[PDB]
Amino acid sequence: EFDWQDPLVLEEQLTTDEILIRDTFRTYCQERLMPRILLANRNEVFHREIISEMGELGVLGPTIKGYGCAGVSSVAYGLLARELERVDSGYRSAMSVQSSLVMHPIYAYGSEEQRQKYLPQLAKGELLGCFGLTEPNSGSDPSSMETRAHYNSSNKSYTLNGTKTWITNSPMADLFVVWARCEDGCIRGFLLEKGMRGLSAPRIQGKFSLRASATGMIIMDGVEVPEENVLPGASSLGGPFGCLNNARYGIAWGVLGASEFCLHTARQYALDRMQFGVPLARNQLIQKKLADMLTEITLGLHACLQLGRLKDQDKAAPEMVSLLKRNNCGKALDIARQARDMLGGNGISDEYHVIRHAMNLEAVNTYEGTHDIHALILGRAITGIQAFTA
Amino acid sequence: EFDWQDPLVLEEQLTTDEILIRDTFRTYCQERLMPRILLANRNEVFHREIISEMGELGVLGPTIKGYGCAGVSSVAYGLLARELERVDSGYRSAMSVQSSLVMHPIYAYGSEEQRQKYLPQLAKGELLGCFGLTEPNSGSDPSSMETRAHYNSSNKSYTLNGTKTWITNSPMADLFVVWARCEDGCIRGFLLEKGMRGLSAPRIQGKFSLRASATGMIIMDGVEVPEENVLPGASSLGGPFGCLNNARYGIAWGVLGASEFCLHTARQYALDRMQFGVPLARNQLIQKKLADMLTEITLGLHACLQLGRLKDQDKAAPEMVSLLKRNNCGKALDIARQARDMLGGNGISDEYHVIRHAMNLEAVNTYEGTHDIHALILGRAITGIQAFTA
Amino acid sequence: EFDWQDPLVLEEQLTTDEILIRDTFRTYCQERLMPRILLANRNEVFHREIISEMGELGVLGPTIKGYGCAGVSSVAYGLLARELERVDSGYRSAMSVQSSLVMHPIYAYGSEEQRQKYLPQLAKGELLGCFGLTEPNSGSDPSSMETRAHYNSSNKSYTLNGTKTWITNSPMADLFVVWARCEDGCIRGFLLEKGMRGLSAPRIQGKFSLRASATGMIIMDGVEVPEENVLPGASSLGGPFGCLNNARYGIAWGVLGASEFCLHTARQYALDRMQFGVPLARNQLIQKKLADMLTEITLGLHACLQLGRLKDQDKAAPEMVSLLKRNNCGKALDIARQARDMLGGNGISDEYHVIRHAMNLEAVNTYEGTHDIHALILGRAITGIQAFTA
Amino acid sequence: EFDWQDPLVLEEQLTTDEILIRDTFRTYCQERLMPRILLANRNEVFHREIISEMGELGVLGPTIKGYGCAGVSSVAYGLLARELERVDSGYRSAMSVQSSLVMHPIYAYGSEEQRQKYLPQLAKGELLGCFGLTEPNSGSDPSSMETRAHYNSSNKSYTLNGTKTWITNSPMADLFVVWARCEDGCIRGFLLEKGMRGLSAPRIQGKFSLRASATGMIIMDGVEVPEENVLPGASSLGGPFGCLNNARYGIAWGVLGASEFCLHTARQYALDRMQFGVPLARNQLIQKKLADMLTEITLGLHACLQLGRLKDQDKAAPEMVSLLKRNNCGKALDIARQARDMLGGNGISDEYHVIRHAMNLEAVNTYEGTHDIHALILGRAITGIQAFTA
Ligand SMILES: CC(C)(COP(=O)(O)OP(=O)(O)OC[C@H]1O[C@@H](n2cnc3c(N)ncnc32)[C@H](O)[C@@H]1OP(=O)(O)O)[C@@H](O)C(=O)NCCC(=O)NCCSC(=O)CCC[N+](=O)[O-]
Ligand SMILES: CC(C)(COP(=O)(O)OP(=O)(O)OC[C@H]1O[C@@H](n2cnc3c(N)ncnc32)[C@H](O)[C@@H]1OP(=O)(O)O)[C@@H](O)C(=O)NCCC(=O)NCCSC(=O)CCC[N+](=O)[O-]
Ligand SMILES: CC(C)(COP(=O)(O)OP(=O)(O)OC[C@H]1O[C@@H](n2cnc3c(N)ncnc32)[C@H](O)[C@@H]1OP(=O)(O)O)[C@@H](O)C(=O)NCCC(=O)NCCSC(=O)CCC[N+](=O)[O-]
Ligand SMILES: CC(C)(COP(=O)(O)OP(=O)(O)OC[C@H]1O[C@@H](n2cnc3c(N)ncnc32)[C@H](O)[C@@H]1OP(=O)(O)O)[C@@H](O)C(=O)NCCC(=O)NCCSC(=O)CCC[N+](=O)[O-]
Ligand SMILES: Cc1cc2nc3c(=O)[nH]c(=O)nc-3n(C[C@H](O)[C@H](O)[C@H](O)COP(=O)(O)OP(=O)(O)OC[C@H]3O[C@@H](n4cnc5c(N)ncnc54)[C@H](O)[C@@H]3O)c2cc1C
Ligand SMILES: Cc1cc2nc3c(=O)[nH]c(=O)nc-3n(C[C@H](O)[C@H](O)[C@H](O)COP(=O)(O)OP(=O)(O)OC[C@H]3O[C@@H](n4cnc5c(N)ncnc54)[C@H](O)[C@@H]3O)c2cc1C
Ligand SMILES: Cc1cc2nc3c(=O)[nH]c(=O)nc-3n(C[C@H](O)[C@H](O)[C@H](O)COP(=O)(O)OP(=O)(O)OC[C@H]3O[C@@H](n4cnc5c(N)ncnc54)[C@H](O)[C@@H]3O)c2cc1C
Ligand SMILES: Cc1cc2nc3c(=O)[nH]c(=O)nc-3n(C[C@H](O)[C@H](O)[C@H](O)COP(=O)(O)OP(=O)(O)OC[C@H]3O[C@@H](n4cnc5c(N)ncnc54)[C@H](O)[C@@H]3O)c2cc1C
Query: Which residues of chain B are within 8 Å of residue C389 when distances are taken between CB atoms?
Result: 390
Among all bound ligands, the one having the nearest atom to the CA of A81 is: 1
Query: Which residues of chain B are within 8 Å of residue D366 when distances are taken between CB atoms?
Result: 341, 344-345, 347-348
Nearest CB among C344, C348, C349 relative to A139 is that of C344
Give yes or no for residue D161 CB within 6 A of ligand 8.
no
DSSP string, C281-307: GGSHHHHHHHHHHHHHHHHHHHHHHHH
Q: From the candidates B348, B366, B368, B389, which should be mutated to test the interface with D, based on the most D CB atoms within 10 A?
A: B348
Under a CB-based contact definition with an 8 Å cutoff, are residues A55 and A66 in contact?
no
Q: Closest-CA residue in chain B for A380?
A: B287
DSSP string, B83-111: HHHTT-HHHHHHHHIIIIIIIHHHHHHS-
Under a CB-based contact definition with an 8 Å cutoff, are residues B306 and B312 in contact?
no
Distance CA C20, CA D298 (A): 29
Is residue A30 helix, strand or coil? helix
* Minimum distance, in Å, between the CA of residue C288 and any CA atom of chain B: 9
Distance CA C329, CA C341 (A): 19
Distance CA C122, CA C110 (A): 14
The answer to whether D285 contacts A283, with C-beta atoms less than 8 Å apart, is no
Contacts of A49 (CB under 8 A, 6+ apart): none
CA-to-CA separations, D258 to A103, B319, D26, D263, D301, in angstroms, rounded: 61, 38, 13, 9, 12
The answer to whether C287 contacts D375, with C-beta atoms less than 8 Å apart, is yes
Amino acid identity of D382?
I
Distance CA B236, CA A306 (A): 40
In order of their start, the domains of chain A are 1-128 (1.10.540.10), 129-235 (2.40.110.10), 236-390 (1.20.140.10)
Longest CA–CA separation in chain B, Å:
82
Give yes or no for residue B135 CB within 6 A of ligand 2.
no
Residue C351 DSSP class: G
Give yes or no for residue C388 CB within 6 A of ligand 3.
yes
CA-to-CA separations, D55 to A199, A288, B69, C67, D51, in angstroms, rounded: 82, 51, 66, 62, 6
Nearest Cα neighbor of C96 from C215, C223, C244 is C244
Is residue B181 helix, strand or coil? strand
Is residue C255 helix, strand or coil? helix
A342 is in an annotated binding site: yes
Query: Which residues of chain C are within 8 Å of residue D380 when distances are taken between CB atoms?
Result: 287
Residues 316-335 of A with CB under 8 A from C: none
Q: Touching check for D390 and chain A: CB below 8 Å? A: yes
Q: What is the 3-class SS of chain D, one letter each residue?
A: CCCCCCCCCCHHHCCHHHHHHHHHHHHHHHHHHHHHHHHHHHCCCCCCHHHHHHHHHCCCCCCCEECCEECCCHHHHHHHHHHHHCCCHHHHHHHHHHHHHHHHHHHHHCCHHHHHHHHHHHHHCCCCEEEECCECCECCCHHHCCCEEEEECCCCEEEEEEEEEEEECHHHCCEEEEEEEECCCCEEEEEEECCCCCEECCECCCECCCCCCCEEEEEEEEEEEEHHHEECCCCCCHHHHHHHHHHHHHHHHHHHHHHHHHHHHHHHHHHHCEECCEEHHHCHHHHHHHHHHHHHHHHHHHHHHHHHHHHHCCCCCHHHHHHHHHHHHHHHHHHHHHHHHHCHHHHHEHHHCHHHHHHHHHHHCCCCCCCCHHHHHHHHHHHCCCCCCC
Q: Closest-CA residue in chain D for B166?
A: D345
Strand-strand pairing, D175-182 and D148-152: parallel
Nearest CB among D9, D303, D379 relative to C290 is that of D379
Report the nearest-CA residue for atom 16 of ligand 4.
Answer: D238
Residue C184 DSSP class: T
Active site residue B368: yes
Which residues form ligand 1's pocket by a CB distance below 6 Å? A 93, 96-97, 131, 133-134, 140-143, 168, 236-238, 241-242, 244-245, 247, 318, 367-369, 373, 377, 386, 388
Contacts of A333 (CB under 8 A, 6+ apart): A358, A361, A362, A365
Best of B104, B244, B311 to mutate for ligand 2, by most ligand atoms within 8 A of CB? B244
Phi/psi of residue D234, each to 5°? Answer: -110, 120
Residue C207 DSSP class: B
Phi/psi of residue A305, each to 5°? Answer: -55, -55
Residues 168-207 of C with CB under 8 A from D: none
Beta bridge partners of C336: none
Distance CA D307, CA D256 (A): 15
What's the distance, CA D81 to chain centroid? 8
The answer to whether A350 contacts C206, with C-beta atoms less than 8 Å apart, is yes
What's the distance, CA B346 to chain centroid? 28
Beta bridge partners of D167: D216
Report the binding-site residues of B: 92-93, 131-140, 166-168, 241-248, 273, 284, 341-345, 369-372, 388
Amino acid identity of A241?
F
* Span from the CA of A349 to the centroid of ligand 7 (angstroms): 13
Query: CA A356, A358, A360: angle at the middle one, nearest 5?
Result: 65
Per-state percent for chain C, helix, strand, coil, to nearest 5: 55, 15, 30
Distance CA D206, CA D324 (A): 30
Sign of CA dihedral B54, B60, B62, B66: negative
Residue A193 DSSP class: E
Is residue A98 helix, strand or coil? helix
Report the nearest-CA residue for atom 53 of ligand 8.
Answer: B345
**Count of other CB atoms within 10 angstroms of residue A18:** 20
Active-site residues of C, by number, are 368
Under a CB-based contact definition with an 8 Å cutoff, are residues B369 and B320 in contact?
no
Distance CA D120, CA D98 (A): 12
Phi/psi of residue D172, each to 5°? Answer: -125, 40
* Span from the CA of A359 to the centroid of ligand 4 (angstroms): 43
Nearest CB among C284, C290, C387 relative to D382 is that of C290
Report the binding-site residues of B for substrate: 92-93, 140, 241-248, 369
Amino acid identity of A131?
F
What's the distance, CA A173 to chain centroid? 16
The answer to whether C276 contacts A139, with C-beta atoms less than 8 Å apart, is no
Distance CA D329, CA D248 (A): 10
Q: How many CA atoms within 13 Å lie on the side-chain side of D111?
A: 11
**Which residue intervals of chain C are DSSP H helices?**
16-28, 34-42, 49-57, 74-85, 89-96, 104-109, 112-124, 238-272, 284-312, 318-342, 354-364, 373-383
**Which residue intervals of C97-231 are DSSP H helices?**
104-109, 112-124
Distance CA B378, CA C245 (A): 37
Residues in chain C: 390
Nearest CB among B288, B389, B390 relative to C285 is that of B288
State the Rg of chain B over Cα: 21
Distance CA D60, CA D46 (A): 17
Query: Which residues of chain B are within 8 Å of residue C283 when distances are taken between CB atoms?
Result: 284
Best of B272, B275, B290 to mutate for ligand 8, by most ligand atoms within 8 A of CB? B275
* Span from the CA of D142 to the centroid of ligand 4 (angstroms): 8
Q: Touching check for C2 and chain A: CB below 8 Å? A: no
Instruction: Looking at the CA of residue A275, tell me the nearest atom of ligand 7.
Output: 38
| Resolution for this PDB entry, in angstroms | 2.6
**Which residue intervals of chain A are DSSP H helices?**
16-28, 34-42, 49-57, 74-85, 89-96, 104-109, 112-124, 238-272, 284-312, 318-342, 354-364, 373-383
Distance CA C140, CA C142 (A): 6
A141 is in an annotated binding site: no
The answer to whether C290 contacts D9, with C-beta atoms less than 8 Å apart, is no
Q: How many CA atoms within 13 Å lie on the side-chain side of C295?
A: 27
